[PDB]
Amino acid sequence: IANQPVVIDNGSGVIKAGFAGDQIPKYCFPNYVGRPKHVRVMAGALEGDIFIGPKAEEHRGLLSIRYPMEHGIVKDWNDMERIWQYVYSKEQLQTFSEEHPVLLTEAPLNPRKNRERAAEVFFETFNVPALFISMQAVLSLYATGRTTGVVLDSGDGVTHAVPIYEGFAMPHSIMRIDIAGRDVSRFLRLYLRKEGYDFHSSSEFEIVKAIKERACYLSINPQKDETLETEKAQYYLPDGSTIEIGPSRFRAPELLFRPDLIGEESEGIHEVLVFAIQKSDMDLRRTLFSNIVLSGGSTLFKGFGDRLLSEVKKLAPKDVKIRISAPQERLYSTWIGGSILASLDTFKKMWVSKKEYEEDGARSIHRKTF
Template sequence: MFCGDETGAYVMETGWTNSRFGWGGAADPCLQIPTLLTSSNTIGLSALHSSSNTGGATPIFNNPNNTSEITNWDAWETLLSSSMSQTVCQNRPILSTDPGFSPPGQKETQTEIMFEKFDTPAYFISHTAALSAFSLGRHTAMVVDCGGGGNVATPVIDGMVLKRSLRRSVRGGDFLDMQIKEVIEKKTGKPLAVRPERQTTGKYKTPSKAYLSSLTPSQKTYRSFCLHETLTDFKKSHGVSLQFAKVDMREVSGLIPDDSVYELPDGTPVNVNEHPDLYVVPEAMFMEGPLTSSKTDAPALIDVEGNDQDQPQTDPSLLDVPLHRLAHEALSSADVDCRKELLMNLVLCGRGSCFSGVDTRLSKELTAMTPSTFRVKVSSGKGEERSNASWIGGSILTSLGSFQQLWLSKAEYDEYGSTLAVQRFP
């Protein structure tokens, strides 16, 4: 049924903060929707008032540290239905992404919804890490994804994800946002002010109710979203250097332009030059145990040739470790024969990795933790290519003629049911 290079497949990625949708073979997604502003009936700003009796829109994901577990299936269906309506997607094969740590049975539920509700002719679920590696032309790579809900390090061998070696950390984009928020509030002496979109100040002032501090409790989700957007804009507009291993405020102050001033939504100016601790907030990504009461011992070196030193067993669940140690944990649990190639193909992606110098810093830290005879090479896209890495990988995958035989077709689903998804989508 699908045997050509051009199938017109629809690629969808549902993330913690944003969801991306578009057509296979395209360079960028044609639609991006805030995942947090989604309810069981609608998406966007109107979703804030769709559930006034229950406190506002119920997110698709309840736990930011586990953005793979869909807890609100009605909202997930609404998000997909709205995206397909806006992009005029009908009767097309659909590829969706999965971070690799979904709860049992979730893929079966997704498959049932796709065939029963959306009547897709073919469906496939691919791992986010594998797609991110494909976006940079790698079939074997150590993928380090810095998302809003947390960081994930995943070894990929010949396009197959090593689930037992997957490691996750709480230190994602939301963690850094909270660090920046605390510093700004401490410096200004008042809560960080944010406001809804299109609400202006100055000559054309709007009523005081435009400020989020006066919004009703039913709009708590939107308040969180606007706060996220404000802090993301701060991070984007002020480059951050991570090229030094130890933070020296005198050194940092010399790197910041004298006129580096950021204006908050309420008009309060924040001179970053006067507050260098704002400039080094992303250093928390590499700090040893800032969230714990005691620091852990330095990890043992990895012997890529196969002579492993004794290392403690690591908990495969959520960790509280810096970015380089997270990659080290995932690398240590991979087969020794693969480690050399993984070190040479370390893929850095995710919106939280767009700070200046993150790739250089990660390479430096991992080089210090590995034998000197092996090289660490970090590859990453530029700008939006890094943020949309997994979607771009899905776009590439669905446009390959050799991939078309892997689709789970409607005929196969009718014959074998959704249980076939467990075998087809490992």
């Protein structure tokens, strides 16, 4: 049973899906489960009472949105099962789970219990013929067409700098933080309350994400922007009322570089990138500096790459050629790589078959990934 395999690229913020050997993921939607706050009085209302994807985006105000996955670690397993069921259902894929092999993705260095429980869901609840979990950095390099280079990424949950050199993903040199787009959105929400405009509701939380996506920019010199007084630019909400954003827009994405502002000890994106290069061998450092690939949604801030280049110039040894490259479609970089990896004839060897899982168990899944 070697049908066209499916590539479900997981993520805390957004979840991508579709078939192998494709240019773009056809099925992209945000990873959450909306449920109705209000009392459904009238007959002929929205049926089901568990909303995922575009229906939930259309009917935000009704639904109490909650995310199942934080920092690449699922909290609510029943919610992720409903999301995966919605992916396979007629509203999105129009396929059965029994036909196609599965390509899953996860952030590196996660708890193994969650990886085991993920496999249990795919093999038992769904009747998958073969499963395969993989890295995000390895796929992003397959999407670009390079083998050597570091992959800095920044989704909604995790930020991790994985160094790879000619098909050798060093498991030891992988740096990681639990600081990312969701924490930046939460930090921007806190700043908007300091400005004046309070947002506490779960449906109203996605307006803060929309403001973060649209009206934000990362300054090169933060001390210079602190001394100067801001212009206070405007933005229209979904309702109609205008909001002067003020200094919150530029101080919000500083969290990624300065993790002390939220109140939690971490390295930072720029430190993690330097740190992933340093932990590798001495001969391979200069090739890793030359090939730095960006990925994820939280790398799309204005003057983000320029700030990363300046931070590398400050920390790294002098007289070294720095190059932070990036693809055009930074959001769909990991999925394209999975679609390429799935289309290859080698893919049959790497996967965990259902028969092999039934015989061995979790140990076979731990062996095949690394």
